[PDB]
């Protein structure tokens, strides 16, 4: 028997406006959700999601094996030593069903000082031939800034919810240095479906991706209308309903650190479903040198003894660790 998690739908539109009292009522809902299962759906968000799934499937189903190799990250192509994060993540027929494409801050170019310095976690995006995928790059870059704007407002909600000024988080979230990433994931329908691609959980549940905490400040996710996600509660794993018009939001391990675990990073996993579906996370990461001073909203004095963490090194350790634990994606 598997229960369903309480994931409220929060109208976040006041976070874009100037009704400060209305914003506090949104922050309260974010507070409650972060203290419950950790998840909530952001609705009335103003982003056009109507074609996100189609474009994601179109791009994945129309890209050729030759193109995949030419864009593949280092894990799949030894000739691309600089592509650790951005590029194509090939499937492995018979062994690995998922495939995806990851891109970073469009402002990361050869002129960027972090690219010039070869700083870890910074890379220049690789893109397919414009003529083979017309309008794909323009769409991708515009979506990055569309979800950036949504994420900036959500961070204002989290800051107010924690008793801080609305810019407590967003001030470190900037277009000229953010390490945030978009991933365009395709989960294919396969018949037969290779068992080597399915993992069996301790509780017997068949999975495509095992338990983990997110490496982010917050995660802003859109998915097609196929239920798959689960959150661990003390009463066991609980199904997270799908909502192909809203954005599923949750806190990452960086938030759990700086809040002294007041807003825990929920443990989540992906159930195996034999169906064609798309998953498009936006990982809200700060700058490489961004540092937020921890605090404890549970203490009268609000003091925390935790060490302030540079976000860049945190992201570098988090991503490698996640690959080491749940495998290369
Ligand atoms: C559960 C979803 C978020 C999705 N999973 C994911 O996107 C998973 C877990 S958060 N993400 C990762 O493994 C880390 C990707 C980091 C990215 N290449 C980068 O360099 O920034 C899925 O649908 O499998
Ligand atoms: Cl202090």
UniProtKB/Swiss-Prot annotation:
Catalytic EC class: oxidoreductase
Keywords on record: Antibiotic biosynthesis, Cytoplasm, Iron, Metal-binding, Oxidoreductase, Vitamin C
Residues holding Fe(2+): 212, 214, 268
Catalyzed reactions per annotation: N-[(5S)-5-amino-5-carboxypentanoyl]-L-cysteinyl-D-valine + O2 = isopenicillin N + 2 H2O
GO molecular function: iron ion binding; isopenicillin-N synthase activity; L-ascorbic acid binding
The record's free-text note on cofactor binding: Binds 1 Fe(2+) ion per subunit.
Assembly information from the UniProt record: Monomer.
Protein name: Isopenicillin N synthase
